[PDB]
Design an enzyme around this catalytic site. Structure first.
Site, PDB file in Angstrom:
ATOM      1  N   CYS A 152       0.639  -0.976   0.291  1.00  0.00           N
ATOM      2  CA  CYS A 152      -0.045   0.117   0.091  1.00  0.00           C
ATOM      3  C   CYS A 152       0.720   1.313  -0.039  1.00  0.00           C
ATOM      4  CB  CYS A 152      -1.039   0.194   0.716  1.00  0.00           C
ATOM      5  SG  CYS A 152      -2.573  -0.952   0.552  1.00  0.00           S
ATOM      6  N   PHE A 203     -10.337  -4.387  -1.106  1.00  0.00           N
ATOM      7  CA  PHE A 203      -9.314  -4.218  -2.309  1.00  0.00           C
ATOM      8  C   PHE A 203     -10.088  -4.519  -3.709  1.00  0.00           C
ATOM      9  CE2 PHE A 203      -6.722  -5.388   1.512  1.00  0.00           C
ATOM     10  CZ  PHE A 203      -5.957  -4.144   1.551  1.00  0.00           C
ATOM     11  N   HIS A 291      -3.464   8.071  -0.545  1.00  0.00           N
ATOM     12  CA  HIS A 291      -3.726   6.565  -0.619  1.00  0.00           C
ATOM     13  C   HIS A 291      -5.072   6.415   0.430  1.00  0.00           C
ATOM     14  CE1 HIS A 291      -3.313   2.309  -1.635  1.00  0.00           C
ATOM     15  NE2 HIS A 291      -3.750   2.207  -0.281  1.00  0.00           N
ATOM     16  N   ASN A 324      -9.656  -0.229  -3.039  1.00  0.00           N
ATOM     17  CA  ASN A 324      -8.236   0.070  -2.629  1.00  0.00           C
ATOM     18  C   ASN A 324      -7.485  -0.628  -3.840  1.00  0.00           C
ATOM     19  OD1 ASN A 324      -5.599  -0.171  -1.246  1.00  0.00           O
ATOM     20  ND2 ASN A 324      -6.657  -0.117   0.810  1.00  0.00           N
TER      21      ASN A 324
END
Lengths: 376, 378
Positions: A152, A203, A291, A324
């Site tokens: 990440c 994700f 992020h 994500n």
């Protein structure tokens, strides 16, 4: 080279399989054969609600899970099935994003001198970097940087490495590819050991590709952002934040429930460290690329930096549209602010502002802080 | 930054458990309880014989083995057990080498601005890089480059990457750690799986660590080599040269018999690309550090560049004393060369010679070619 490393093209790609977050718990619990776990399903229904994710693209399909059912068993060995998918899938998805970047760039691919390949999904020898040069027909003598198991924060990792590559090598042109397929961390629901259950909601799959270079040839090259500065730091006392182990049963996942608070405690320090050297003290005078590890992380950053409530729209936007995307996610967000600013008629490529800060968060806990200068 | 990226210190470490190659076939077939495979046992003895390896250091112990017996199976799920070993062992072994490099360096830990961690054995999140800065007490803000699943050519990779970090960042000091533990690749002997069996005879464990920087502070820092240039190219039609897959049964290994010839075919071009810009044509006028992928690659490079017969003595030395140490191997050979040179009273750190070439050979097949400039000894 001469001048700051400059981003000159951005392309993205996703797997074709789209899944609406609003239908994910039904599918997921249907597919893992877990519908008797109704309380579990309700919880999961609720986690999906709070993700602020509208949809995700997944290379993993329902046929694949049928053929490889052990991927649905919690401690059944399933790495080999997962590798079979991602060792092929990751560089293919990456090639797709790369073609778009190369096409946007417009120059001959023989001018690409350096390749950075980045993923968190599988490993192989020869690497995903090798397969990408083959897939693309890049020079056999291109210099490669094979970044495996990165996580990440690695969207900032690839810019920080590209910067030094581009700037130390006159006329160098760097291709960055982050390609992520979350099949590696798919797991069935487990009452006990709920750990990876929030991962199933969070994700998504995708790849982002970038062309980066110093001294752009302004006639035929179009600068999008300059990379001013990059920082990497480990947040004190946060080793517990996130742990992911590659085991027989796949990529494991533990996420500490106070990660957003770990970010809240350290994020102004990172901001100040990056902007203070530039003479900036007003966080709202700059644009932000954050992020989206989860919605709560975005809200904490917004809170602790006292951001106006539109400041993280681009970040919230790609979380929404994609989930994500691990290492490729902030690169999607870079594209998002640059495209939205052109669409809106902004005076610059960074929402009409001159400077911006991108954050990547990963295991450690690690923070990557990249200062971007807009163009125009 | 400054002038060329310069190697200013190097440290090496190995596991304490050593095994005489001469005894390895017996040790191997007995721990894997593959005694009845007398034929294959004979076959393996011949392979051990021809390796030109006298001993290897190994983190893998027989009681870890008899404790995690599936590692012994000729294929059975064992990755968890291997990971259990290497996720801890790779950064600890690497820490051991880095302390030695930093001690030689002599400057404060705090001045290390960048860390490149390289391995081929296992992966974890957070990575071996994280673990290392914690083990050493490096700065939390050190810039990390976590190089996983890299392979036999990555000794050149870390130099190529160190070079640009050090040269583009004024006053930066890069710590390079390559640490390898061959336990991810251990397997029992099985009939038609011979490349995997050749690997049971080839690979040894170790870690190397370097301090790299530009603009050395000539008062306190001691240049050993300068990194002049760096090339990476994939060799045509050699994809099959080597393949390693990380699967439930650990890391696979497949090595084509013709790999020594594939290198031979391509090596003079590599040398020429590296040395022609320097106006050098005389291969014997330079020092060579050749990744001992095997003894046959060394023989072949030697034959093809027609080097004098002890030109590759240093590369042969560490293959013999350590086995094939994958990504750290050529870094062991850089240290061997400069240490043997100072000891023989050579006028340079590079066998008394000015320029030298180091070769890494990995999957692709890939060749990394880095040119090193020696330093004058007094």
């Amino acid at each position: 080279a001469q001048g700051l490393a400059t981003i000159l093209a951005i392309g993205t790609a996703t797997p074709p399989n789209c899944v609406a977050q609003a239908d994910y718990a039904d599918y997921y619990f249907r597919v893992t054969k877990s519908e008797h776990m109704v309380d579990l399903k309700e919880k999961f229904k609720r986690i999906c609600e709070k993700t602020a994710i509208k949809k995700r693209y997944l290379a993993l399909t329902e046929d694949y899970l049928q053929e490889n059912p052990t991927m649905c068993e919690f401690m059944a060995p399933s790495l080999n099935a997962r590798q079979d998918l991602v060792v092929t899938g990751v560089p293919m998805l990456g090639k797709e994003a790369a073609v778009k970047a190369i096409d946007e760039w417009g120059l001959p691919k023989s001018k690409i001198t350096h390749l950075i390949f980045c993923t968190t999904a599988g490993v192989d020898m020869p690497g995903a970097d090798y397969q990408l040069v083959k897939l693309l027909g890049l020079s056999p003598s291109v210099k490669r940087y094979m970044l495996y198991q990165q996580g990440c924060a690695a969207g900032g990792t690839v810019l920080r490495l590209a910067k030094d590559l581009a700037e130390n090598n006159k006329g160098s042109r760097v291709l960055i590819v982050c390609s992520e397929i979350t099949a590696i961390l798919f797991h069935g629901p487990n009452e006990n050991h709920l750990d990876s259950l929030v991962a199933q909601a969070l994700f998504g799959d995708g790849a982002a590709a970038l062309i980066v270079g110093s001294g752009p040839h302004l006639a035929v090259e179009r600068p999008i952002f300059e990379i001013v500065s990059t920082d990497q730091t480990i947040l004190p006392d946060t080793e517990k934040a996130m742990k992911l182990h590659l085991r027989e049963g796949g990529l494991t996942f533990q996420l500490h429930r106070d990660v957003p608070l770990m970010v809240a405690k350290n994020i102004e320090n990172a901001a100040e460290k990056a902007l203070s050297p530039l003479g900036i003290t007003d966080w709202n005078s700059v644009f932000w690329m954050v992020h989206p590890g989860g919605r709560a992380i975005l809200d904490q950053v917004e809170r602790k930096l006292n951001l106006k409530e539109d400041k993280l729209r681009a970040s919230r936007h790609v979380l929404s549209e994609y989930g994500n995307l691990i290492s490729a996610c902030v690169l999607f967000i870079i594209d998002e602010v640059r495209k939205r600013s052109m669409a809106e008629g902004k005076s610059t490529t960074g929402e009409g502002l001159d400077c911006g800060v991108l954050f990547g968060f990963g295991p450690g806990m690690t923070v990557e802080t990249v200062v971007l200068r807009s163009v125009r």
